[PDB]
């Protein structure tokens, strides 16, 4: 199984410098070798066999080089050690021993096969020795996937290759707001070309002025114009030895591993357009093509060596099941009387009937034998149809769990499954007082030494299959052979309303009975799906058939029914053909963390949502990194392992070099998490100072410098990330005292656009709710900007890559109000000036810039108060909040303001205010002591009422990224009723003209609280 | 009709859903326009409001329930357990709950910590399993090739050459009773501590109903101060 540690032996973090292996010899003989703990297997190869001469039989020894290693790993697994190159310290041994012997079978698919392995963080053998015919199933047919995606990769090469690779990085509509498209000089931009000429890197710059919608092979001809300016050439040599070279060239941002191999408008790579908003100058290196086609590696896959029925609607009986017994339960007979098993079958968590309970039954022994009957009919059942039981202790009379575990009543082969079924039952989550959890995890929990209860599933003398679609469509014509004014208004008005709306029963019926008219307003279908009774197959056979001839939805709405509301597979294929079809892969890569989570929901392995990502994923190699990481990240979790094991299997088997690049991230991440892992348990006792003599210490050695240098950043793989520079390297103080690391950015052109890459490397602390916090602030902007709302965010970078560990992206030139105020010499005082925050800007944006500054500032500002209002971030403080030397401010620190967010002992609910502080006001109106009334203030105002107004316009879409995050497994997105807030901040249930007098009262309540004393800073006396 | 019982003001879904939770089909509660909250299928069902659909037969709310009444309902009143003596005893049961609460964090702790060493010890086991075995094989690859030489050697006088292979082999099984060792050793912590397990699990379970019924009727104290 996967290991818990990153120590270097078991149950050990760091191996002694020097250790005694006992080496096992083909002769059959034991030597013990006392070895360096970073000595390669090469050098302890060639000390064993010289030493082996002093023992007997050295006769039968061979050369030195018809032998392998092998040892067991941490993981229990036989490894045979190719790459010898490869370190004592990072074998990932149990036991320090080795065994040398005869190489067995196909060399190749045995490396590749453990690369896989260390990829995924589990040896690719457990899934060989895994009888259900379901997981060997996927394991084989995905491939299928995997095939499509490497023919697409390979069908126009070498161009093909470089665009899995290095895939443009596009804003997904051409088109600029006038706020964007006013910054140009006269709808034209000027840009910097690079050529490198001589062997020694010397470089020319041809610095061309060009309309901002050229695609790079205009930039190209254009920087050819320029050099072929004065060679006596005609209009038509000219025109003709453009044509000719303009694609013989690409450009490359210079600094990174980003390249424009596609002919989008220039202005519409987010590089480009950065630089436009951000008034910066673009940088482009121009090379040839076969400069970059030669270096791709033109990768080869491996085909791995893993290569009587009665319909349903003619069984017209009720559904009935038997509780045979389980094998124990953990009770104490003392205090508790009796338990019994109470059971129910569900749609996701909407129960399809009333739920059914056995006898009470002495906690000593638990054995029911007793047939369970179920209030609906075999022909009734839907296809996502579920039994989810549990078992219960009774002790007025309360009621509690014990074990739970829910069943799939239809296999993946549409089976509707009979005769006997162990299942291993689950552990209640924490706080789940509830009797069921039918959102938890569907199958058997593969713990065997947990209670174990068997079931009897009813016989009916043959296979019992879900019907055909050719049946379900007939049945329809069955079904239904048996207006107003105020009508049409009424269910347009229905569409309008948000997903967390509750709908009373009449609408449902008054949905369902229009449901003909609902075809012509297509978005309506997430609540025309709730109207539905799904314990009627008469209604089901029927909505089947609108769902196949429905209008396609935009993407945005698609994303709902993949949500935990929406488990019909046909409901849910819908949703993927709209993705299909109308996702561009900017979006996907933007909403990618919600799609990987929905996986989970999915009831059977092979599915089309699996099928559509990995397809993605395979190409497209920046979609694909974010696949990898975000399921790698849950592999450590009981629930998933297997699921997204055989996902990440599949994915690896055909994603090409970059495995190759991606255990160089795994491996160098691995060193951190020991690393880290010392100083949060056995050294946590120890001074800060001797802690950082440690760290430099251990971070000197050869084995760590070799691991963490020559990597792609996992925040962002178009960054190299170099050489360490150590002397900048330091534990930073902050909440589990995380590692702040500095590579040299190795790029050839680094100096154009930054020579040292800071990542903060944190162990300890969840960061999946800062990684959603940072998503949604970007989605807010994205929307800001494409209404043509100027309001600047930061949505800095961060990665959850396992438990509790994940990297944050620094941000350069920027500081804390905290850190701003200290800088300007407090001299002591109580209260910090007011005054100082815009004194600190004016000195570092004087004169000339100063009022673009106080713009940022003021841009900036407007934005994190309206995100930091609707999102409810109570908790901000003068280190949470920090500001750059333009005048940028942002928000860092996520993850604690929902800490306070349940009442107790009665103490009512805890209010998030909108305050504003006075030093940002006193900013915004340029040193005004009267901030409250100037142009300055109302020009804020407004930019925060449209704001406000514009996210309140798209707040079906944050509630559905919300809603797709509830299965995930935050503790604070549990459900629907953690959302709700939402509702109330964006006034949901009022009108516009409403919410816009409820936001502009909140925000005018903020600065009646002005002139706070605050009569100490460190303490709040 | 504002008196009347089963009328919860104008409250959120989240606390309706609550009550709801848990009930026999009929149970009910009227919440703000007025809306109705019911029990069908195990399910709460949302009705709006006099009338539902088109003849809008009755004159007011009260009236409209007690038709269809010809269902239980929940009460905003009725608190089965002077203002001086309950102002004492929420002090008394809420520490009474507070300090089985934070025995119940301090089990699960345990319970936690217990289960993952549990697996540990469980891939520790499959590995010592591995690692006895691959010794198996060597003390197997041992005699093979020992059989050759030790006949020779025997056949001379030397039994020099005896005595070095047989100072090896003895090695050899001797680390092997030491793996067996360390293998039985972590196999009666694991039992040992598997038991630990299931002991902490009877305790939680014990005492989750107990802090269930400690909120029940903490919560219903609290409910007759505020009326
Ligand atoms: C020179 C140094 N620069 C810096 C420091 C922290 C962050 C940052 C830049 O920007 C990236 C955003 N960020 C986010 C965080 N952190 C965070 O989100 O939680 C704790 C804290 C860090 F300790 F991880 N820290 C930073 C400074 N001002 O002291
Ligand atoms: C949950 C959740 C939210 C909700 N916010 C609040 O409930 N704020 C609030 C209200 N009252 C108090 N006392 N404290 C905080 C909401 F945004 F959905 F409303 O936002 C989240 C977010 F951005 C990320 C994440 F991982 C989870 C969530």
Known sequence: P?????????????????????????????????????????????????????????????????????????????????????????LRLFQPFLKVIEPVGNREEKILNREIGFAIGMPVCEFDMV????????????????????????????????????????????????????????????????????????????????????????????????????????????????????????????????????????????????????????????????????????????????????????????????????????????????????????????????????????????????????????????????????????????????????????????????????????????????????????????????????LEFDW?????????????????????????????????????????????????????????????????????????????????????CLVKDWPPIKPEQAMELLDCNYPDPMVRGFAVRCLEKYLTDDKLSQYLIQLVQVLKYEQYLDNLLVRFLLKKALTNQRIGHFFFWHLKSEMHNKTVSQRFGLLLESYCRACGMYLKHLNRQVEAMEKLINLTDIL????????????????????????????????????????????????????????????????????????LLFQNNEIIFKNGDDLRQDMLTLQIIRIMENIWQNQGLDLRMLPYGCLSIGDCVGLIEVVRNSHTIMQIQCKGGLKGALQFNSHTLHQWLKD????????????????????????????????????????????????????????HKKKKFGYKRERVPFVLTQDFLIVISKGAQECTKTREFERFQEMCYKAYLAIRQHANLFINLFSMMLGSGMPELQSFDDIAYIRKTLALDKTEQEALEYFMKQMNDAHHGGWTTKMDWIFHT | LQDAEWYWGDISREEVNEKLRDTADGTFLVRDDYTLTLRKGGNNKLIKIYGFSDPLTFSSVVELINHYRNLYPVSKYQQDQNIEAVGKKLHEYNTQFQ?????????????????????????????????????????????????????????????????????????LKSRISEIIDSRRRLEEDLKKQAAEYREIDKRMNSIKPDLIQLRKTRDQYLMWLTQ
């Open chain 1, 2 to 90: 996967p290991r818990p540690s990153s120590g270097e032996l078991w149950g050990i973090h760091l191996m002694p410098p020097r250790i005694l292996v006992e080496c096992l010899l083909p002769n059959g003989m034991i030597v013990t070798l006392e070895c360096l703990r970073e000595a390669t297997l090469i050098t302890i190869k060639h000390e064993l066999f010289k030493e082996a001469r002093k023992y007997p039989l050295h006769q039968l020894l061979q050369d030195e080089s018809s032998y392998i290693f092998v040892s067991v790993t941490q993981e229990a697994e036989r490894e045979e050690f190719f790459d010898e190159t490869r370190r004592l310290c990072d």
């Open chain 1, 131 to 454: 009888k259900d015919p379901e997981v060997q199933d996927f394991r084989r047919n995905i491939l299928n996937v995997c095939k499509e995606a490497v023919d697409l990769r390979d069908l126009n090469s070498p161009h093909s290759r470089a665009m899995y690779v290095y895939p443009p990085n596009v804003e997904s509509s051409p088109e600029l707001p006038k706020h964007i498209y006013n910054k140009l000089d006269k709808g034209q931009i000027i840009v910097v070309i690079w050529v490198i000429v001589s062997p020694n890197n010397d470089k020319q710059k041809y610095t061309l002025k060009i309309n901002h919608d050229c695609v790079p092979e205009q930039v190209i001809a254009e920087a050819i114009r320029k050099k072929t300016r004065s060679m006596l050439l005609s209009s038509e040599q000219l025109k003709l030895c453009v044509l000719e070279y303009q694609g013989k060239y690409i450009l490359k941002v210079c600094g990174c591993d980003e390249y424009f191999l596609e002919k989008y408008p220039l202005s519409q790579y987010k590089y480009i357009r950065s630089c436009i908003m951000l008034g910066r100058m673009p940088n482009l290196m121009l090379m040839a093509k076969e400069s970059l086609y030669s270096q791709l590696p033109m990768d080869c896959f491996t085909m791995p060596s893993y290569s009587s029925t009665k319909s349903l609607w003619v069984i017209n009986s009720a559904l009935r099941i038997k509780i045979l017994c389980a094998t124990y339960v953990n009770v104490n007979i003392r205090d508790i009387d009796k338990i019994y098993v109470r059971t129910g079958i569900y749609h996701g968590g909407e129960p399809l009937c009333d739920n059914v309970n056995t006898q009470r039954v002495p906690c000593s022994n638990p054995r029911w034998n007793e047939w369970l009957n179920y209030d609906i009919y075999i022909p009734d059942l839907p296809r996502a149809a579920r039994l989810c039981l549990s078992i219960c202790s009774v002790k007025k009379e309360e009621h509690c769990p014990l074990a739970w575990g829910n069943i799939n009543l239809f296999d993946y082969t549409d089976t509707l499954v009979s005769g006997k079924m162990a299942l291993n039952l689950w552990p209640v989550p924490h706080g789940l007082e509830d009797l069921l959890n039918p959102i938890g995890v569907t199958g058997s929990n593969p713990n065997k030494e947990t209670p174990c209860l068997e």
């Open chain 1, 460 to 544: 009916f003398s043959s296979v019992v299959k879900f019907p055909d679609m050719s049946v379900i469509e007939e049945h329809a014509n069955w079904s239904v052979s048996r207006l107003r004014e105020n009508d049409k208004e009424q269910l347009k008005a229905i569409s309008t309303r948000d997903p967390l709306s509750e709908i009373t029963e009449q609408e449902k019926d008054f949905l369902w009975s229009h449901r003909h008219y609902c075809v012509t307003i297509p978005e309506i279908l997430p609540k025309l799906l709730l109207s539905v009774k799904w314990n009627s197959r008469d209604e089901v056979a029927q909505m089947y």
């Open chain 1, 680 to 751: 949060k348990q056995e050294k946590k006792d120890e001074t800060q100072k001797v802690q950082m003599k440690f760290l430099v210490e251990q971070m000197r050695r050869p084995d760590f410098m070799d691991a963490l240098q020559g990597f792609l950043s996992p925040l962002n793989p178009a960054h190299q990330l170099g050489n360490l520079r150590l002397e900048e390297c330091r534990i930073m103080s902050s909440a589990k005292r995380p590692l702040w690391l500095n590579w040299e950015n190795p790029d050839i052109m680094s100096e």
């Open chain 1, 844 to 899: 570092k944006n004087k004169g000339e810039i100063y009022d673009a500054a106080i713009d940022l500032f003021t841009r900036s500002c407007a934005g994190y108060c309206v995100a930091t209002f609707i999102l409810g971030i109570g908790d901000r403080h003068n280190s949470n909040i920090m500001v750059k030397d333009d005048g940028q401010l942002f928000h860092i620190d996520f993850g604690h303001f929902l800490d």
């Open chain 2, 99 to 171: 300090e089985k609460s934070r025995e119940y964090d301090r089990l699960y702790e345990e319970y936690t910590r217990t289960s993952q060493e549990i697996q540990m010890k469980r891939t520790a086991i499959e590995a010592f399993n591995e690692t006895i075995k691959i010794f198996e094989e060597q003390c197997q690859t041992q005699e093979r090739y020992s059989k050759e030489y030790i006949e020779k050697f025997k056949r001379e006088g030397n039994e020099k050459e005896i005595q070095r292979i047989m100072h090896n082999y003895d090695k």
